[PDB]
């Protein structure tokens, strides 16, 4: 009925386990967000002191020349400086948790100077106001995802559950994800978020949790400027720019620093830039008024309720992606998130381009409320999904359609083939355990191949050339899986990269275009066999080239290796149907190619009391230098075989291999 007894904690202290993941305890809100610094510290440190001298503004100064076009950049869009004012706007209640989170940072430097590079090490102190530039930069200024959130009555026990998959790079700094577990007298929260930031934006607890993927909410307008006698035309008229005159630092190669001068130039829609062609543009970003995202983050994972939640997000202070949440009372929402111009004109793609710079006709000033956008909450189907995809099919039956909304706020483009996987996979299924569900995840179905070898293989067989023949017969005998042992995978991937273009998204040579209508069923057929069957033909000549044979084995070429962890590989690209990513990168000169993307924070929450949850961390929980904790999980990936995430006091009790007491 209720949920399990919250812990008290009556000390300050960090548990961690085995993996490098830290269960900080607190006495209080502050307490527990200075652990929460101290341990990205120490998991994260150099990066993360990289980043927020980055978002000071530093780069160049600090760092030289390669970091000069961020520090332009950045000052020009005046972030640096918005954030000094962001911090102070903050209450007064969360302006102590980041001070106190910015603190523990500097605390583990200070009691830990042989863990902190030499080059980052001019960063310190940080402050709280350091903490806000970064989620500024990181939110306004700078893939793929998965997401699941099943109802009660869609399951075998009654409880919800809840998928948290992001996609991002393997290797941006910024973009590293990290895991851990917070626990004061008043909450508790468990999960993954991108190094740097206080607050945890995949996260669950006994109650309820969230996840997170990539809605491209058009959040910024570029408006082509005609310029005229030193201003620009403006309803008929020239204004005069605003003009300051601002300036950095640039490192030399001999340590020393030079001055730069940096005009910086403003029309009433924003700062302006000149592009390498000419053109005269100025950006114009919703939600620079907007102080709040932390704080929303916060409040939306430690929500009492779902009423509470909703008050939360309903504040607009987080710019961009679609949200999806699950409670334990059984409540499932999809939320199609952020901070979107009211606009009496223009379809997507309008907002998208450059807009006309010479008329208030185009100068919007408000923006969209959150019941003006694309949500679903506890729907007939039973389950919430986003893989990436347009808004249109985030359950099944459907509860509304694209012309329910504004045509500016998403496209209506062709849903990938892992878009329709996912609302296939759980559609489809009834009566889910949190086991089947796991075992949904792993999904890797060649879908395309599904669409398109029925026509192809026929065509392919009638070629005079044997060899094209022998890859007909070899696609036609394969179980359009991808799995390890698949000898017709990559030779079929090849195929595609021609077929559907290098990013398997292309659309031209389906027989049957995609539809609204059949949207998980569409597109099909190949439009012309002849002309695919050429297609093959080369790609028989680039599989060769690239893999030394037409029937390599998938998870040969295909590895995961992170220090001296080299394990074999399967799934692979979402466009092609792979629930499960992992974004390949080109082969070396053996043809052994690794995940660019994909797989990063991977977790499977159900909402039974107490909740049971299990995941993996493809890069593991720390990349400082010398750690165990890097490539600690990668192996456990290969297999699929995920840890049980620990938030019940006795369960990390038991895993605890280091203690970190602290002070606050
Ligand atoms: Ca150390």
Do not use: C
């Not at 949920?3 to 960090?14: M, T």
């Amino acid at each position: 009925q209720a949920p399990i007894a919250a812990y008290k904690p009556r000390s300050n202290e960090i548990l961690w386990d085995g993996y490098g993941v830290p269960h900080i305890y607190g006495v209080d809100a502050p307490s527990a967000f200075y652990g929460y610094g101290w341990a990205q510290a120490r998991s994260h440190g150099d990066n993360i002191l990289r980043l927020y001298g980055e978002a000071r503004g530093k780069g160049a100064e600090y760092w030289g020349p390669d970091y000069e076009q961020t520090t332009v950049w950045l000052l020009t869009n005046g972030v640096p400086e918005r954030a000094q004012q962001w911090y102070a706007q903050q209450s007064p209640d969360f302006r102590a948790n980041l001070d106190a989170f910015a603190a523990g940072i500097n605390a583990y430097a200070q009691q830990n100077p042989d863990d902190i590079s030499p080059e980052v090490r001019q960063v310190l102190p940080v402050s709280g106001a350091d903490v806000v530039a970064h989620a500024h930069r990181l939110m306004n200024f700078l893939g793929g995802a998965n997401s699941w959130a099943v109802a009660p009555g869609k399951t075998a026990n009654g409880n919800a559950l809840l998928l948290q998959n992001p996609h991002l790079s393997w290797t941006t700094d910024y973009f590293t994800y990290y895991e851990a577990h917070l626990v004061t007298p008043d909450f508790e929260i468990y999960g993954a978020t991108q190094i740097g930031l206080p607050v945890i934006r995949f996260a669950f607890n006994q109650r309820m949790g969230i996840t997170n993927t990539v809605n491209g909410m058009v959040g910024a307008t570029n408006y082509r400027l005609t310029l005229q006698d030193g201003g620009y035309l403006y309803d008929g008229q020239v204004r005069p720019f605003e003009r300051r005159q601002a300036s950095y630092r640039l490192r030399q190669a001999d340590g020393t620093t030079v001055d730069k001068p940096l005009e910086i130039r403003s029309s009433v829609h924003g700062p302006v830039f000149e592009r390498a062609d000419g053109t005269a543009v100025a950006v114009r970003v919703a939600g620079l008024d907007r102080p709040g995202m932390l704080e929303q983050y916060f409040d939306m994972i430690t929500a009492d309720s779902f009423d509470d939640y909703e008050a939360a997000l309903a504040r607009m202070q987080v710019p961009t992606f679609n949200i999806v949440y699950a409670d334990r009372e059984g409540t499932i929402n999809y939320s199609f998130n952020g901070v979107a111009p009211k606009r009496a004109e223009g379809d997507i793609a309008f907002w998208q381009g450059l807009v006309p710079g010479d008329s208030s006709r185009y100068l919007w000033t408000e923006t969209h409320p959150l019941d003006d956008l694309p949500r679903v909450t506890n729907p007939p189907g039973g389950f919430v999904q986003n893989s990436n995809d347009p808004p249109w099919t985030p359950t099944w039956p459907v509860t509304y359609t694209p012309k329910d909304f504004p045509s500016y706020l998403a496209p209506q483009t062709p849903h990938s083939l892992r878009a329709q996987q996912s609302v296939r996979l759980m559609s489809e299924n009834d009566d889910l355990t949190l086991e089947r569900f796991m075992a949904l995840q792993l999904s890797h179905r060649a879908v395309m191949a599904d669409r398109t070898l029925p026509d192809l293989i026929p065509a392919a067989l009638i070629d005079p050339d044997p060899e094209v023949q022998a890859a007909a017969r070899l696609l036609a005998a394969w179980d359009r899986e991808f799995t390890s042992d698949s000898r017709a995978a990559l030779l079929f991937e090849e195929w595609a990269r021609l077929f559907a273009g290098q990013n398997f998204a292309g659309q031209a040579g389906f027989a049957t275009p995609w539809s609204l209508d059949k949207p998980v069923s569409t597109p099909y057929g190949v439009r012309d066999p002849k002309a695919a069957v050429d297609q093959l033909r080369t790609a028989i000549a680039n599989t060769k080239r690239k893999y030394g044979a037409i029937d390599r084995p998938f998870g040969d070429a295909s590895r995961m290796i992170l220090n001296d962890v080299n394990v074999p590989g399967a799934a692979g690209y979402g466009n092609l149907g792979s629930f499960r990513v992992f974004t390949w990168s080109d082969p070396d000169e053996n043809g052994v190619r690794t995940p660019v993307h994909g797989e990063t924070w991977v977790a499977m929450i159900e909402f039974s009391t107490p909740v049971r949850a299990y995941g993996l961390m493809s890069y593991g929980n720390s990349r400082q230098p010398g750690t165990t904790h890097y490539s600690d999980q990668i192996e456990r990936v290969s297999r699929a075989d995920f840890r049980e995430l620990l938030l019940r006091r006795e369960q990390v009790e038991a895993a605890v291999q280091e203690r970190t007491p602290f002070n606050f």
